[PDB]
Amino acid sequence: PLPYHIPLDPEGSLELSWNVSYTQEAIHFQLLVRRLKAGVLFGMSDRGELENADLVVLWTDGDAYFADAWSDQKGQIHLDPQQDYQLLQVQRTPEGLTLLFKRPFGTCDPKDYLIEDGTVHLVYGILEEPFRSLEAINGSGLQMGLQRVQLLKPNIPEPELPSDACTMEVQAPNIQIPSQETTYWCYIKELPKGFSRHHIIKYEPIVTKGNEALVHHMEVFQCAPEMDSVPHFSGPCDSKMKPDRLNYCRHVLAAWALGAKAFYYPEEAGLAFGGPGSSRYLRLEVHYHNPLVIEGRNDSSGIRLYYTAKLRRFNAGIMELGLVYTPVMAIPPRETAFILTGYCTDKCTQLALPPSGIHIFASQLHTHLTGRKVVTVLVRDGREWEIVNQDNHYSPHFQEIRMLKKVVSVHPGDVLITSCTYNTEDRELATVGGFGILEEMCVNYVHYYPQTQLELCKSAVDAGFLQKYFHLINRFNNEDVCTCPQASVSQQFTSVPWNSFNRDVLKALYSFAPISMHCNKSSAVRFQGEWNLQPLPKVISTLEEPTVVS
Amino acid sequence: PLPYHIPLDPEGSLELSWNVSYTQEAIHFQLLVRRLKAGVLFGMSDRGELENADLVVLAYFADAWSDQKGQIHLDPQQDYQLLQVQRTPEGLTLLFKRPFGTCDPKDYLIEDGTVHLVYGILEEPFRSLEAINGSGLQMGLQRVQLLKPNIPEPELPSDACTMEVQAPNIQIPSQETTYWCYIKELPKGFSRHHIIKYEPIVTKGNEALVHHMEVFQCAPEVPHFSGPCDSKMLNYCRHVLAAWALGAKAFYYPEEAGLAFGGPGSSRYLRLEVHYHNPLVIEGRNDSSGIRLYYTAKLRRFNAGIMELGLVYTPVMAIPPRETAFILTGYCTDKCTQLALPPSGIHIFASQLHTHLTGRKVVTVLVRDGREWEIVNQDNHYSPHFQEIRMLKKVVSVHPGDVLITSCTYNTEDRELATVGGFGILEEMCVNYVHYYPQTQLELCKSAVDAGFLQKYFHLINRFNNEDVCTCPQASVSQQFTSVPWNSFNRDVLKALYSFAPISMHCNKSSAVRFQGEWNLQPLPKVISTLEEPTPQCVVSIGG
Ligand SMILES: *[C@@H]1O[C@H](CO)[C@@H](O[C@@H]2O[C@H](CO)[C@@H](O[C@@H]3O[C@H](CO[C@H]4O[C@H](CO)[C@@H](O)[C@H](O)[C@@H]4O)[C@@H](O)[C@H](O)[C@@H]3O)[C@H](O)[C@H]2NC(C)=O)[C@H](O)[C@H]1NC(C)=O
Ligand SMILES: *[C@@H]1O[C@H](CO)[C@@H](O[C@@H]2O[C@H](CO)[C@@H](O[C@@H]3O[C@H](CO)[C@@H](O)[C@H](O)[C@@H]3O)[C@H](O)[C@H]2NC(C)=O)[C@H](O)[C@H]1NC(C)=O
Ligand SMILES: *[C@@H]1O[C@H](CO)[C@@H](O[C@@H]2O[C@H](CO)[C@@H](O[C@@H]3O[C@H](CO)[C@@H](O)[C@H](O)[C@@H]3O)[C@H](O)[C@H]2NC(C)=O)[C@H](O)[C@H]1NC(C)=O
Ligand SMILES: *[C@@H]1O[C@H](CO)[C@@H](O[C@@H]2O[C@H](CO)[C@@H](O)[C@H](O)[C@H]2NC(C)=O)[C@H](O)[C@H]1NC(C)=O
Ligand SMILES: *[C@@H]1O[C@H](CO)[C@@H](O)[C@H](O)[C@H]1NC(C)=O
Ligand SMILES: *[C@@H]1O[C@H](CO)[C@@H](O)[C@H](O)[C@H]1NC(C)=O
Ligand SMILES: [Cu+2]
């Protein structure tokens, strides 16, 4: 058939399957309607709203007619005089009525939606009641929903597993999530004794059948190699009942977030764990968000690993690009698009990268609720070379590990620039970087080869410069005010009255001020050098991108 | 018959005439080639450079475009549509059509305001487009308003009489640029009349030489003079009855108003200034050109007047160096309009935009209750070298309490220092001269940033780029824009200051007196919102 498919409506009366051609630069959609009552509409839109939508509609109104349509800002449906969607075939089968139609990635028509890399928001609706023309169609009698998907796939078959492949299950024991709002939970598991060295070539999530809903992030780590670690453990990650060490495992075997399905490795590489000289226990950290907050729902959740005995050609690593989690990075309220940027500097890459460089075959983008756009680009001496990963339509609810269509080569001395665009319009206060639900993140997880000791390449604004910012706006408020309060970064940001000047000066600060750079190893230690007050990477540059049927 | 016309090349071997259709949303070009050499190319570009241009080249006719280095390539799409190619006594004429805009974003977009036309004459026979070289290529630009309002010529009062102000059959000096003053006069007595029209008079063959023309009234407080305006034979007869520039057909006052000239307070004597642009330095060329006024004895209902909108002239308004686009905004506040405007309000039928050399874009919008309602005037392609009084397509009504927002976009890329507001050539202006009725006592409605807040700017950036936190002696030392270390932060904070800080408001008559009150530190008008931009709806061979 057509290789990709998803359900649209929960009832499954609507099924969408599609295929992509990058030579023709076009998508072929096939829509299956099993049960058609009244009429049905399908299309795509920016955030998945019915408003400002690029659509296709069918009516039963006659004795069955199909037309291209578009919707305005108020959600009213109008016919499309040109056609972006081109109807190809219509056939009636036992499964239902099938419609094959074709669209280019983009049109010279500016009105239409533009298909590109990253997330695409599909809109579907089932119009319950017969309505005629388009414009009669009302919110009433319309079942109106959205589905998120990646329209442009790498078009590669998922490799699958040799006769050697074995499964290892890393799960929490069956533990009680506190009645607190938010919990981040550490657990210590260990490998069988005398465990020879292996490559994890696959992993998939495991979530208890009542909790799919409660568990929104899971991660599996390795502590520093030099060390033989603490006894067996289940419980929260801040507590001091818990020891010393851990805290020392930032090394990353596995990562899962909402929307991410199973992941298969590229065949050039696998992820190495066990064997001599590289060590220990696995640390599982599970993030529980519990608006529910009722008697402890008992949960053993985790990740399943698929591993092969020994080596594929290269060892694959995972690198964290982005903003460090600190309050000093903040988004003012009532912002339509506000951009936070973080960096991997040439100094860090020069220090931590091999002469050959690394090859990025995958990326996963991560923000919190206010995240809208995420992009990572590659820059060489102030000239933008390549786009590592891009999602303009990105949603926090849909976060998946994507195989890059083109593997990207990163060399020492290159700068990796990561930017996230946020919308704070639903927030009355400044949103700050942090672990909390009301706080934000900008992160790009990169899956690359050959493995290096570089894991966190991240940056943040210099604290001192943020302080002079605060004092600058304070004094712009005039009065006189010789006052030097310290820290309370979250408490300073919440205390700032937000006006055009404060916002613009904050944005200016982010676009100007030097950065505290974090270059850290798998060992959860920095690369020696002085990484504070680094000159802000800047780009001298930018890269340029060029009737009704029946 | 095509209503609008301009010369392109100085030699005058190429002449362009055109027609506008707003239902069809298209321009009809007719190109006249008097002398046909190997080739001719014509088109349009942002500032008038050959690079990145939307073109047509020449019986074979082809649509072309130019790349970043200015090399010419064929256009697979075509915006221009060839209609007719015909041979006449005057030369070879080509009638062709182009839409205002295309769904192709690469192509030029025709809109309100100035359009830069590019022309060339190919000396050398070429077998391709890409073969075209600086060699054998005669290259030029012409600035014009492509979309004119469609105004029918009103009937005349029959009382209406014409007075013609022309050069006294004089000889243009051998110079590239000449400005020529001549003094003409009215009969004595002659009580007040309304000018309801004026149109250009240009001697045949001199079309390329005449760039702009202006008719002025001297100060009431005069001897006869014909010759250059720098000649140092005594006057400022500055103030303006009439203005004309290339491409303009006629200027019409609205049915409600006319411009008054007559017995006192009128001045007695009139001054005409004609601008000759003379590349090639032609010589012994005689010119009678000037402007003809249509005026009536019986006044219409209102007297027409001119109001100055914009930035006050102060150094406090500055543009940092090396900016591609930097925006300065002046304001006419709700308090000023509420006070000085009649209850009925005023109606704006015309506008003239004024900046100095670094000016690129200029826009004036009308805002009601903090919401942008209508665009008074817009030029994104505006140039200081072409500035004319333009009739608005739709007369715009400004009521009491409405806010007028005027913004200019500047390019400082060629400047090493901060450019400041001022009269000088190296300093800047943002001004919109508005022609309206009924005439009121409001003459200058203008604004500027509050000086104190600018002081807070200088001390804030000074204390920020100098490093430490929390120290409070604060001795004040440097107050002015020169000597300032411009980096992204300083620029952005200056922009923030301009976008935030309250303004010193000038509501003036007389230039020597303000209106009725305390105008310092007025709250900056702000727009919760803005308005929607209208959508651009989505090798030939002809027998001669
Ligand atoms: C065309 O317009 C002219 C200007 O209105 C009409 O008047 C003629 O103007 C010229 C120059 O102004 C007068 O020439 C006079 O005689 C000599 C010559 O001036 C200079 O000439 C040569 C170059 O031609 C130059 O190299 C010499 O050094 C001279 O300086 C001057 O000394 C006089 O002061 C004065 O300029 C003509 O006399 C004058 N014509 C008449 C009939 O008075 C001219 O008539 C117009 N022509 C037409 C056909 O309409
Ligand atoms: C949204 O639009 C729909 C239709 O445009 C409205 O829903 C309902 O529409 C049906 C059928 O058109 C109405 O039934 C009526 O039956 C009588 C028979 O006596 C017939 O003469 C009428 O012409 C009509 O067909 C039904 O009354 C109507 N529901 C209502 C009025 O509550 C719906 O009301 C619209 N809602 C909004 C918020 O616009
Ligand atoms: C509108 O009219 C007012 C008149 O009230 C103009 O105000 C200006 O007020 C200053 C007084 O501060 C005067 O100009 C300057 O005076 C200072 C001394 O204070 C002197 O050092 C300067 O050299 C300058 O002369 C004057 O009263 C007046 N200036 C002008 C040019 O009229 C205001 O400027 C007017 N606004 C316009 C015409 O846009
Ligand atoms: C990278 O560098 C070190 C390695 O862990 C971390 O520095 C510690 O950070 C914690 C929390 O901010 C402090 O309590 C410690 O005092 C720091 N140690 C030292 C020696 O400064 C740093 O946080 C790491 N950054 C990451 C992992 O993003
Ligand atoms: C997409 O599907 C069409 C018919 O459904 C087929 O002809 C075409 O080859 C397919 N393209 C692919 C699989 O790339
Ligand atoms: C302009 O286009 C052609 C000129 O030949 C003519 O048919 C048309 O009527 C003209 N329309 C206007 C409004 O000038
Ligand atoms: Cu997170």
Numbering used by the authors:
A (entry chain A): 46 to 108, 110 to 592, 608 to 611
B (entry chain B): 46 to 103, 110 to 272, 276 to 287, 292 to 596, 609 to 614
Task: Paste lines from the article.
Dopamine β-hydroxylase (EC 1.14.17.1, dopamine β-monooxygenase) (DBH) catalyzes the hydroxylation of dopamine to norepinephrine and is thus vital for regulation of these neurotransmitters. DBH is an ascorbate-dependent glycoprotein that requires two type 2 bound copper ions per subunit to be active. Each chain folds into four domains: the DOMON domain, the catalytic CuH and CuM domains, and the C-terminal dimerization domain. The DOMON domain has an immunoglobulin (Ig)–like β-sandwich structure, the catalytic core (the CuH and CuM domains) has the same topology as the structure of PHM, and the dimerization domains consisting of two antiparallel α helices form a four-helix bundle.
Here, we report the first crystal structure of DBH: the structure of full-length dimeric human DBH. In the A chain, the two catalytic CuH and CuM domains are in a closed conformation, and in the B chain, they adopt the same open conformation as seen in PHM. The conformation in chain B is similar to what was observed in the structure of PHM, with a Cu-Cu distance of approximately 14 Å. However, as seen in Fig. 2C, in chain A the two copper ions are close together—approximately 4 to 5 Å in what appears to be a closed active site with a coupled binuclear copper site, as elaborated on below. Three of the four copper sites are not occupied, but the CuM site in chain A is weakly occupied, and a copper has been modeled. Furthermore, the pH in the crystallization condition is approximately 4.2, well below the pKa of the coordinating histidine residues, which therefore will be protonated and not able to coordinate copper. However, we observe that the helices are definitely linked by C528A-C530B and C530A-C528B disulfide bonds. The asymmetry is also reflected in the dimerization domain, where an extra α helix is seen in the A chain. Behind the possible ligand-binding pocket appears to be a metal ion–binding site coordinated by Asp99 OD1, Leu100 O, Ala115 O, and Asp130 OD1/OD2, with Asp114 and Asp126 quite close. On the basis of the presented structure of human DBH, a possible mode of action is that the closed form represents the catalytically active form, and that the open form is catalytically inactive but allows for loading of substrate, release of product, and recycling of the copper redox states.
